């Protein structure tokens, strides 16, 4: 059946804003996963998982009699799709079980691993999500094999449909770079927001870049992709060598024996895929990656044998039985155990990407330190493994259960505890009046609070106004944030705050984070009064102020808005049209299309544009909260044309006289062009809409202000 | 950006079940359009619409000074997409304003029509939907030009995103028949559910079949497509000749001057399309269809001139200025007015498809009767126009406002008014006990009520249990309904009913329609007791019994389930796979995926399959309401394979012994294969889920029982 996407393949896709409705969710509207998880007997689940590790099923026999390596791979792939550019991917929604991730070539046979966990999932039911279970099982694997983990937090609620993630534009699985949809340009520059080298891989190609088995060049790809997943050199070496302490690869025969991935398989496969015609199709005959490597002499026990082997042998290039490039130790004895035949042993083997850890000079230094000091290795791997598997969980307030590590880590963007009484509703009213008496304008107030709160992204739950990081580096100097104007606003608010806090008894105080958001609330209320409407904007106190020392400036960089259609801002020229960037930002803010539309139209007339630009400011009462954006946009008395100077800026002229009335960008005018967005603009541009527009605007403003408030959740 | 649909283009699409969520809807959850409409000043709207008719705008000047013809075409096309096969299409959701219908070639320049209505829509706001406005406007056009309409009902609520309708598989607009995705096979057999001859047309091609100008062969396509839109020969000739009493076609120059349709146009077009480079691009120079025909000597006034011209001249084939085939009156004088130049007149002209009304022998007789008896023509057109524009509105209880016709029409599937006291809760309990004491089984009770209620489709709001049409022709003889079994159940229930009604005072009685549903509810309660659960199933009385004479047997045929996955039924072998048919039926029932899943799994164990088939009956306690379907389907101890006799039936065997445990169809096993369905099945197949399963089953059962109950809305 032909679809709208077929006829108009470049039209903007709004469905991404309307996923995850209560319609697709089987749990009641009142289901709260945190409350369910908090009563789980986590120790009981862990004992069942520990038993499972050595209870082989004949439909997917356990290598070495132990499924630990397979489950560690499973958990690492759950977490390993994460990209810092947009926060998308990661383990936090259990998306490995839906398309496309369930059927990526790098996730082959993890379908088997998830099916092994069904009995445990079935037993505990809604009290443990799949998303938490996948990570918990990797921790139990590690513990069962002698490795002490850093801890574990539950709280990843399950989702019920595929997420809409851009994984690349290639139309062929695993396509090598340089094709018509190449994700590389220039001198091997990987396009943002991607964090893998080929479509369907987690990070890199285990044979080497585009299959070329050069460990030095592979290391460049490892470094780049791991940095795009928030991991530095030490973490990367710790993770790779730690993972490949355990288990083995599978490549017993040619890959052409392997059948359809799960999404393509027949209905009788019951959700499994990659059925293999090679010998038994499983166990000793398994084919997963096509490589046939076993790294250590004790694949089911933590050890420091990965680095003993990497450094204690010289390595020769060889081929697996499927034809893939891999490496074998020169002159070695057969010291590595076979996975099924206790009378067979093998020589040590490595991947090209393992050898990167020795042949890249910066990795080599770290790897040597870890080989000489395996306790340093164990600590680094435990911390990295926790970070990897928790990186998208958000604020520490979301972490549940009895195994949460007490140590606060810088990468968590931590927020200090509040240890004093909070302001009450009368205090809030007193503060709003003091803010408005200061001479700060509606535009300044709304622009500052928007700048602070709109860094939030629901993909990894980073950002938001909690912390008052807008006053710190690097946020205070982002161009979208208008650094000089911002500094002036913050100075005036800090004086208000000092004066209010100086006059209190009993230890009551207000944080700057709270006062920024409250001051924005005062601006919106003043704008509504300017329009003739008395409204109260809700406000919830309890934010705290983070220090510079608790703020990792380099990790904060990915939160910089380079496109923010809500402020009519674009830092430079991109290949993706600005309206598509707007919808992407709306998705990160967790907004529906109605919410996006009201929010944008209100922000335009409040003065929120960067640089006081007049684009989309379709009103003659700026700083009054009215629906004028929509009424003027939809007025058929105005004709619009792209300017000769800039095709992305439009002039609105009176159709009868030619007189210039307005200017706008693509982000402004999409609301009058896209058939779904224009239907929404019509509701708000109608003669009966003024009250509705104000109420809906207040409600989406308060939603945005509260996005990171998991302390209240 | 590669999507799951690109990778697995035949996987099943569940998003169709989760459209129209509260997320994409700008109106509050509590918005009730009926209540808004009932306060509209409809008279005021009609005055404004009458004013609009001759208020020409320079960006799309009015032909003859009067927009009436354009607006009639607008309303006829709004309604004209309707198909009786599935009830999809029609005017009832205002979908002409969204993709793809906003950009179909047949709807060219109706964008202008809708834009002319923006000021009225803006002025009245939420109190008149677009969907109602489009129809009201056509009515006012007719009244303005001297035709008295049969009436009008409001109550078409607006929708907010494109609907998921199968319009065909062609990848080229207007593709002629016989291509790789032809909608025709055999002897010009149009594929169900389609009701148009080419992709992007409303019914037929005005030049003739695949562009061949043969009025006799065109008539065959007219007849078949109009029948697929619920119209017989009389209605068809009335509608065509009535419409083509008014206005004109547009084809002043070659079609190559016409630019991008609305969804393809640039953002500066602000939702309009088909911009033309031919002369002024508009008015006298307009190009819409490419034909240049004006049918009558007074195109802005009702007349009897259509049939005087059709019969009064002989016709010659000619070409418009765009090259299209059309017909001109041999030897006529220039009697037809020009739309813009008072000094030009034209000869009478006709489309191929107009000539069909004279040259097809069955239409000729009707056309002649109408030419000789113009009052019969007028009355037929008025009634057909009402039917056309109200066909998808559902029961008369949905019809709102002061212009609703009092006459009950057969095509509305009318339900008699209830004029007696209803049964109360004590009476319901007494009747449920009588039903359970009669010896009717769980399976018979559930199957009968499901058969009755599941005819409902939310596309056109036809069917459902109200009316007790399951006891009449043709429902009583449908194979899916198990006629012999059904007859036995109905006889027992009618004897219960007769006995209960015989014992009452005060006029209280129970209808058979209510008793069938209540008997179903007793079955579900008995099934829950059989499982050890104490459950009450909600029941709302108030259904009435329709007569055979109130039930048009041929119109009822399209409600026959030829595929009903909920009863594991398929009437024969189709090209569309059965799990796609299941999702389609779920959409018609208005079910979400979780609701579809719970419903099916419960019905399987209750004995609702047609013919007592064991397929999908994954329980050892049939007729008990348990989650066994899910627990057994997901048991990895069972291996599934297609049978050698039939690739659409699967055998489930114990993995270790090979012993046969179950059989199932594609509809059964999809729940264990599709990654989203299987995530839902897991919830209900968990150890903590038995009570949740039961309570969710009851809720969805009740939902289905009440789908047609707009008397309670
Ligand atoms: C450069 C990065 C990495 C590359 C290219 C890579 C490559 C692979 C490949 C090709 C396999 C074999 C799949 C099979 O045939 O079954 C695999 C297995 C495995 N990897 Fe990695 N790996 C990477 C990093 C990681 C990390 C970070 C971890 C965990 C911390 C991990 C843990 C594992 C484990 C445990 C297995 C064994 C699975 C089993 O026993 O079934 N790897 N790796
Ligand atoms: C066999 C069925 C029909 C065919 C092939 C057909 C074809 C068309 C064509 C090609 C146009 C010209 C569009 C343009 O160039 O502007 C048109 C115009 C029109 N049709 Fe039909 N028609 C059909 C049935 C209907 C029916 C059922 C109605 C209404 C009851 C209707 C009412 C109109 C009116 C009022 C116009 C004039 C539009 C204007 O004045 O702008 N037609 N028709
Ligand atoms: Cl994601
Ligand atoms: Cl529809
Ligand atoms: Na994420
Ligand atoms: Na419909």
Is B27 in CB contact (< 8 Å) with chain A? Answer: yes
A272-307 burial, b for 16+ CB within 10 Å, e for fewer? bbbebebeebbbebbbbbbbbbbbbeebbbbbbbbb
Residue indicated by tokens 């169900």: B192
A388 lies in the same domain as A491? no
Is residue B148 exposed (0-12), middle (13-18) or buried (19+ Cβ within 10 Å)? exposed
Token pair, residue A618, equals 């379709």
Helix/strand/coil percent split, chain B, to 5? 45, 5, 45
Pairing relationship of beta strands B336-337 and B345-346 according to DSSP bridges: antiparallel
Q: How open is the CA angle A616-A620-A624, to the nearest 5 degrees?
A: 90
Is A686 in CB contact (< 8 Å) with chain B? Answer: yes
CA–CA separation, A481 vs B223, rounded Å? Answer: 65
Which atom of ligand 1 is the closest one to the Cα of A356?
A: 1
End-to-end CA distance of chain B: 44
* 3 state SS of B479: helix
Nearest Cα of chain B lies from the Cα of A131 at a distance, in angstroms, of 12
Pairing relationship of beta strands A638-642 and A336-337 according to DSSP bridges: unpaired
Q: Are B73 and B252 in contact (CB under 8 A)?
A: no
Q: Are B218 and B254 in contact (CB under 8 A)?
A: no
CA–CA separation, B6 vs A83, rounded Å? Answer: 23
CA–CA separation, A516 vs A466, rounded Å? Answer: 10
Token pair, residue B450, equals 């499901």
Token pair, residue A543, equals 């934010």
User: Closest chain B residue to A642 measured between Cα atoms?
Assistant: B268
Q: Are B325 and B207 in contact (CB under 8 A)?
A: yes
CA–CA separation, B193 vs B656, rounded Å? Answer: 46
| Final residue belonging to a domain, choices A407, A426, A452 | A407
Side-chain-side CA neighbours of residue A391 (13 Å): 25
Is B168 in CB contact (< 8 Å) with chain A? Answer: yes
Token pair, residue B166, equals 């199968």
B276 bridge partner residues: B258
CA–CA separation, A320 vs A48, rounded Å? Answer: 36
A173 lies in the same domain as A298? yes
- The H-or-E segment that residue A641 falls in is strand A638-642
Nearest Cα of chain A lies from the Cα of B160 at a distance, in angstroms, of 7
Chain B contact set for A686 (CB, 8 A): 121-126
Side-chain-side CA neighbours of residue A460 (13 Å): 29
> B77 CB under 6 A from ligand 2?
no
Separation in Å, CA A276 to CA A100, A107, A253, A273, B599: 21, 15, 10, 9, 36
* 3 state SS of B609: coil
CA–CA separation, B154 vs B41, rounded Å? Answer: 12
The CATH number of the domain holding residue B124 is 1.10.520.10
Token pair, residue A472, equals 């710190």
CA–CA separation, B143 vs B385, rounded Å? Answer: 13
Is B99 in CB contact (< 8 Å) with chain A? Answer: yes
A185 bridge partner residues: A189
Token pair, residue A552, equals 């990792």
Nearest Cα of chain A lies from the Cα of B679 at a distance, in angstroms, of 7
For residue B256, what are the contacts with CB-CB under 8 A and spacing of at least 6? none
| Region for A210 from its dihedrals, namely left if φ exceeds 0, alpha if ψ lies in -120 to 50, beta otherwise | left
Kindly report whether the peptide bond that precedes residue B193 is cis, defined as omega within 30 degrees of 0. yes
Helices (H) and strands (E) in chain B, counts: 24, 12
Kindly report whether the peptide bond that precedes residue A164 is cis, defined as omega within 30 degrees of 0. no
Please give the interface size between A and B, counted as residue pairs whose CB atoms are below 8 Å apart.
246
For residue B695, what are the contacts with CB-CB under 8 A and spacing of at least 6? none
Q: Which of A18, A50, A66, A77 is flagged as catalytic?
A: A77
Is residue B554 exposed (0-12), middle (13-18) or buried (19+ Cβ within 10 Å)? exposed
Other Cβ atoms within 10 Å of B471 Cβ, number = 20
For residue A551, what are the contacts with CB-CB under 8 A and spacing of at least 6? A413, A467, A469, A472, A473
B454 lies in the same domain as B559? yes
Side-chain-side CA neighbours of residue A181 (13 Å): 13
User: Closest chain A residue to B112 measured between Cα atoms?
Assistant: A636
A492 lies in the same domain as A450? yes
> B242 CB under 6 A from ligand 2?
yes
Q: How far is the CA of A12 from the centre of ligand 4 (A)?
A: 21
Q: Which of A146, A11, A139 is nearest to A577 (CA)?
A: A11
Dihedral, B683, B684, B688, B691 alpha carbons, nearest 10? 140
Q: How far is the CA of B194 from the centre of ligand 6 (A)?
A: 13
Separation in Å, CA B322 to CA A280, B291, B652: 68, 7, 64
Given ligand 2 and candidates B238, B249, B296, B367, which is best to mutate, with the most ligand atoms within 8 Å of its CB? B249
B31 lies in the same domain as B163? yes
Residue indicated by tokens 């009897």: B304
B12 lies in the same domain as B161? yes
DSSP secondary structure code for residue B251 in this structure: B
CA–CA separation, A91 vs B194, rounded Å? Answer: 44
- The H-or-E segment that residue B184 falls in is strand B184-185
Length of chain A measured in residues? 713
Q: Which of B18, B50, B66, B77 is flagged as catalytic?
A: B77
- The H-or-E segment that residue A639 falls in is strand A638-642
Token pair, residue B235, equals 């209605």
Q: Are A625 and A527 in contact (CB under 8 A)?
A: yes
Phi, psi of B350 (to 5 degrees): -145, 150
Kindly report whether the peptide bond that precedes residue B417 is cis, defined as omega within 30 degrees of 0. no
Q: Are A214 and A357 in contact (CB under 8 A)?
A: no
Other Cβ atoms within 10 Å of B6 Cβ, number = 11
Q: Which of A596, A609, A610, A605 is nearest to A627 (CA)?
A: A605
* 3 state SS of B66: coil
Nearest Cα of chain A lies from the Cα of B364 at a distance, in angstroms, of 38
Q: Residue B587 CA to chain centroid, in angstroms?
A: 12
Other Cβ atoms within 10 Å of A637 Cβ, number = 14
CA–CA separation, A289 vs A206, rounded Å? Answer: 9
Runs of H (alpha helix) within B338-459: 352-359, 361-372, 374-390, 425-437, 442-453
Is A462 in CB contact (< 8 Å) with chain B? Answer: no
Q: How far is the CA of A165 from the centre of ligand 3 (A)?
A: 6
| Region for A511 from its dihedrals, namely left if φ exceeds 0, alpha if ψ lies in -120 to 50, beta otherwise | beta
B457 bridge partner residues: B462
Length of chain B measured in residues? 713
Helices (H) and strands (E) in chain A, counts: 24, 12
- Point out the residue among B18, B119, B199 whose CB comes nearest to the CB of A24: B18
SS (H, E, C) A409-463: CHHHCCCCCCCCCCCCHHHHHHHHHHHHHCCCCHHHHHHHHHHHHCCCECCCCEC
A145 bridge partner residues: none
Q: Are A625 and A531 in contact (CB under 8 A)?
A: yes
Based on the residue annotation, tell me whether A250 is a catalytic residue of this protein: no
- The H-or-E segment that residue B519 falls in is helix B512-530
Dihedral, A22, A23, A26, A28 alpha carbons, nearest 10? 40
Separation in Å, CA A525 to CA A433, A591, A602: 11, 22, 13
A152 lies in the same domain as A10? yes
- Point out the residue among B4, B115, B162 whose CB comes nearest to the CB of A99: B4
Token pair, residue B191, equals 């594929």
Phi, psi of A61 (to 5 degrees): -50, 140
Is residue A330 exposed (0-12), middle (13-18) or buried (19+ Cβ within 10 Å)? exposed
Q: Which of B105, B263, B83 is nearest to B165 (CA)?
A: B83
Chain A contact set for B169 (CB, 8 A): 1-2
Nearest Cα of chain A lies from the Cα of B539 at a distance, in angstroms, of 22
A313 lies in the same domain as A220? yes
Q: Are B616 and B667 in contact (CB under 8 A)?
A: yes
Other Cβ atoms within 10 Å of B201 Cβ, number = 19
The CATH number of the domain holding residue A348 is 1.10.420.10
Q: Which of B294, B367, B283 is nearest to B327 (CA)?
A: B294
Q: How far is the CA of B114 from the centre of ligand 6 (A)?
A: 20
Dihedral, A326, A329, A332, A336 alpha carbons, nearest 10? -50
B152 lies in the same domain as B8? yes
B111 lies in the same domain as B5? yes
Chain B contact set for A36 (CB, 8 A): none
Other Cβ atoms within 10 Å of A11 Cβ, number = 15
Among all bound ligands, the one having the nearest atom to the CA of A461 is 5
Annotated ligand binding at A244? The verdict is yes
Q: How open is the CA angle A576-A582-A588, to the nearest 5 degrees?
A: 110
Q: Do A4 and B592 touch (CB under 8 A)?
A: no
- Residue to mutate among A6, A268, A649, with most B CBs inside 10 A, is A268
Q: Are B686 and A125 in contact (CB under 8 A)?
A: yes
Q: Are A553 and A541 in contact (CB under 8 A)?
A: no
CA–CA separation, B576 vs B7, rounded Å? Answer: 19
Domain of residue B615, residue span: 565-688
Q: Are B539 and B463 in contact (CB under 8 A)?
A: no
CA–CA separation, A23 vs B233, rounded Å? Answer: 43
SS (H, E, C) A449-508: HHHHHCCCECCCCECCCCECHHHCCCHHHCHHHCHHHHHHHHHHHHHHHHHHHHCCCCCC
Token pair, residue B284, equals 């006298």
CA–CA separation, A81 vs A291, rounded Å? Answer: 21
For residue B28, what are the contacts with CB-CB under 8 A and spacing of at least 6? none
Separation in Å, CA A629 to CA A41, A620, A671, B98: 54, 10, 10, 22
Chain B 227-256, residues with CB within 8 Å of chain A CB atoms: none
Q: Are A449 and A443 in contact (CB under 8 A)?
A: no
Helix/strand/coil percent split, chain A, to 5? 45, 5, 45
For residue A380, what are the contacts with CB-CB under 8 A and spacing of at least 6? A234, A235, A238, A370
A173-183 burial, b for 16+ CB within 10 Å, e for fewer? bebbbeeeeeb
Chain A 650-679, residues with CB within 8 Å of chain B CB atoms: 650, 655-656, 666, 669-670, 672-676, 678-679
A38 lies in the same domain as A49? yes
Q: How open is the CA angle A29-A30-A36, to the nearest 5 degrees?
A: 125
- The H-or-E segment that residue B336 falls in is strand B336-337
Phi, psi of B347 (to 5 degrees): -75, 155
Q: How open is the CA angle A657-A661-A662, to the nearest 5 degrees?
A: 145
- The H-or-E segment that residue A661 falls in is strand A660-665
Q: Are B481 and B469 in contact (CB under 8 A)?
A: no
Chain A contact set for B264 (CB, 8 A): 8
> B70 CB under 6 A from ligand 2?
yes
Q: Are B171 and A2 in contact (CB under 8 A)?
A: yes
Q: Do B263 and A7 touch (CB under 8 A)?
A: yes
Q: Is the dihedral of CA B520, B522, B525, B529 positive or negative?
A: negative
Q: How many domains does chain B have?
A: 4
B547 lies in the same domain as B614? no
Q: Are B195 and B228 in contact (CB under 8 A)?
A: yes
B51-62 burial, b for 16+ CB within 10 Å, e for fewer? ebbeebbebbbb
Q: Are B625 and B694 in contact (CB under 8 A)?
A: yes
Is A15 in CB contact (< 8 Å) with chain B? Answer: yes
- Residue to mutate among A123, A196, A673, A678, with most B CBs inside 10 A, is A673
Residue indicated by tokens 């050069």: A214
Token pair, residue A536, equals 């109260």
CA–CA separation, B79 vs B96, rounded Å? Answer: 9
Q: Is the dihedral of CA A142, A146, A149, A154 positive or negative?
A: positive
A258 bridge partner residues: A276
CA–CA separation, B318 vs B251, rounded Å? Answer: 13
List ligand 1's pocket residues with C-beta within 6 A.
A 63, 69-70, 72-73, 76, 203-204, 206, 222, 239-240, 242-244, 246-250, 288-289, 291, 353
Chain B contact set for A655 (CB, 8 A): 58-59
DSSP secondary structure code for residue A640 in this structure: E
CA–CA separation, A31 vs B18, rounded Å? Answer: 19
Chain A 469-498, residues with CB within 8 Å of chain B CB atoms: none
DSSP secondary structure code for residue B211 in this structure: G
End-to-end CA distance of chain A: 43
Other Cβ atoms within 10 Å of B287 Cβ, number = 29
A287 bridge partner residues: A251
Q: Do B103 and A169 touch (CB under 8 A)?
A: no
DSSP secondary structure code for residue B546 in this structure: P
Separation in Å, CA A292 to CA B284, B626, B655: 76, 47, 29
* 3 state SS of B569: strand
Nearest Cα of chain A lies from the Cα of B11 at a distance, in angstroms, of 7
Q: Are B600 and B446 in contact (CB under 8 A)?
A: no
Q: Do A263 and B672 touch (CB under 8 A)?
A: no
Q: Which of A196, A188, A189 is nearest to A170 (CA)?
A: A196
Q: Are B308 and B273 in contact (CB under 8 A)?
A: no
Q: Which of B382, B298, B371 is nearest to B336 (CA)?
A: B298
Q: How far is the CA of B22 from the centre of ligand 6 (A)?
A: 20
The most distant pair of C-alpha atoms in chain A lies apart, rounded to whole Å, by: 94
Pairing relationship of beta strands A325-329 and A349-350 according to DSSP bridges: antiparallel
CA–CA separation, B394 vs B413, rounded Å? Answer: 9
CA–CA separation, A598 vs B464, rounded Å? Answer: 39
CA–CA separation, A592 vs A570, rounded Å? Answer: 22
Token pair, residue B363, equals 């239409």
CA–CA separation, A246 vs A305, rounded Å? Answer: 10
- The H-or-E segment that residue B639 falls in is strand B638-642
């Amino acid at each position: 059946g032909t679809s709208n996407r077929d006829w108009w393949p470049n039209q903007l896709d709004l469905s991404i804003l309307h996923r995850h409705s209560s319609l697709s969710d089987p749990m009641g509207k009142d289901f709260n996963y945190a409350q369910a998880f908090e009563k789980l007997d986590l120790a009981a689940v862990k004992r069942d998982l520990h038993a499972l590790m050595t209870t082989s099923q004949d439909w997917w026999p356990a290598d070495f009699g132990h499924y630990g390596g397979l489950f560690i791979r499973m958990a690492w792939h759950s977490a390993g799709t994460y990209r810092t550019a947009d926060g998308r991917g990661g383990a936090g929604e259990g998306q490995q079980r839906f398309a496309p991730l369930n059927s990526w070539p790098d996730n082959a046979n993890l379908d088997k691993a998830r099916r092994l966990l069904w009995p445990i999932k079935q037993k505990y039911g809604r009290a443990i999500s799949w998303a938490d279970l996948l990570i918990l099982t990797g921790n139990v694997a590690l513990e069962s094999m002698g490795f002490k983990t850093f801890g574990f937090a539950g709280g990843r609620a399950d989702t019920w449909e595929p997420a809409d993630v851009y994984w690349g534009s290639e139309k062929i699985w695993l396509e090598l770079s340089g094709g018509p949809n190449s994700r590389y340009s220039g001198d091997r520059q990987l396009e943002n927001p991607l964090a893998a080298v080929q479509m369907g891989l987690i990070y890199v190609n285990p044979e080497g870049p585009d299959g070329n088995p050069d460990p030095v060049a592979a290391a460049r790809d490892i470094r780049d992709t791991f940095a795009r997943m928030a991991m530095n050199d030490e973490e990367t070496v710790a993770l790779i060598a730690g993972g490949h302490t355990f288990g083995k690869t599978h490549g017993a025969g040619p890959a052409s024996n392997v059948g359809a991935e799960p999404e393509a398989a027949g209905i009788e496969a019951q959700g499994l895929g990659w059925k293999s015609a090679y010998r038994t199709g499983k166990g000793a005959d398994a084919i997963t990656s096509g490589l046939e490597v076993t790294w250590t002499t004790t694949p089911t026990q933590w050890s420091h044998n990965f680095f003993e082997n990497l450094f204690g042998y010289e390595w020769e290039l060889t081929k697996s039985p499927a034809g893939a490039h891999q490496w074998v130790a020169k002159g070695a004895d057969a010291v590595i155990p076979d996975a099924f035949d206790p009378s067979k042993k093998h020589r040590p083997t490595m991947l090209t990407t393992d050898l990167s850890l020795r042949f890249d000079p910066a990795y080599e230094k770290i790897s040597r330190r870890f080989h000489e000091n395996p306790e340093q290795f164990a600590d680094a791997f435990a911390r990295a493994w926790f970070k990897l598997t928790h990186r998208d969980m958000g604020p520490r307030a979301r972490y549940l259960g009895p195994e949460v590590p007490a140590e606060v880590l810088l990468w968590q963007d931590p927020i200090p505890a509040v240890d004093h009484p909070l302001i009450d509703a009368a205090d809030a009213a007193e503060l709003k009046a003091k803010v408005l008496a200061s001479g700060l304008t509606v535009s300044q107030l709304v622009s500052t609070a928007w700048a602070a709160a709109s860094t939030f992204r629901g993909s990894d739950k980073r950002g938001g106004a909690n912390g008052a990081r807008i006053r710190l580096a690097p946020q205070k100097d982002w161009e979208a944030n208008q650094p000089e104007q911002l500094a002036a606003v913050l100075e005036t608010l800090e004086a208000i705050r000092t004066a209010f806090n100086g006059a209190q008894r009993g230890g009551k105080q207000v944080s700057l984070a709270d006062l920024i958001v409250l001051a924005g609330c005062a601006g919106v209320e003043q704008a509504a009064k300017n329009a003739g409407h008395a409204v109260t904007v809700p406000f919830a106190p309890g934010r705290a102020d983070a220090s510079q020392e608790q703020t990792d400036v380099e990790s904060m960089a990915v939160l910089e808005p380079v496109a923010d259609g809500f402020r009519n801002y674009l830092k430079g020229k991109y290949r993706v049209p600005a309206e598509v960037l707007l919808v992407d930002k709306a998705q990160l803010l967790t907004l529906s299309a109605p919410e996006m539309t009201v929010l944008l139209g209100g922000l335009r007339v409040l003065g929120a544009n960067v640089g006081q630009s007049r684009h989309g400011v379709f009103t003659a009462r700026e700083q009054a909260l009215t629906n004028d954006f929509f009424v003027n946009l939809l007025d058929m008395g105005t004709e619009w044309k792209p300017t000769a100077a800039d095709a992305d800026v439009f002039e609105g002229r009176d159709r009868a006289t030619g007189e210039l009335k307005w200017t706008g960008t693509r982000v402004d005018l999409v609301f009058g062009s896209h058939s779904q967005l224009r239907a929404l603009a019509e509701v708000y541009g109608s003669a009966d809409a003024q009250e509705k527009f104000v109420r809906d605007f207040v409600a989406v403003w308060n939603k945005v202000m509260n996005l990171d408030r998991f302390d209240l959740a």
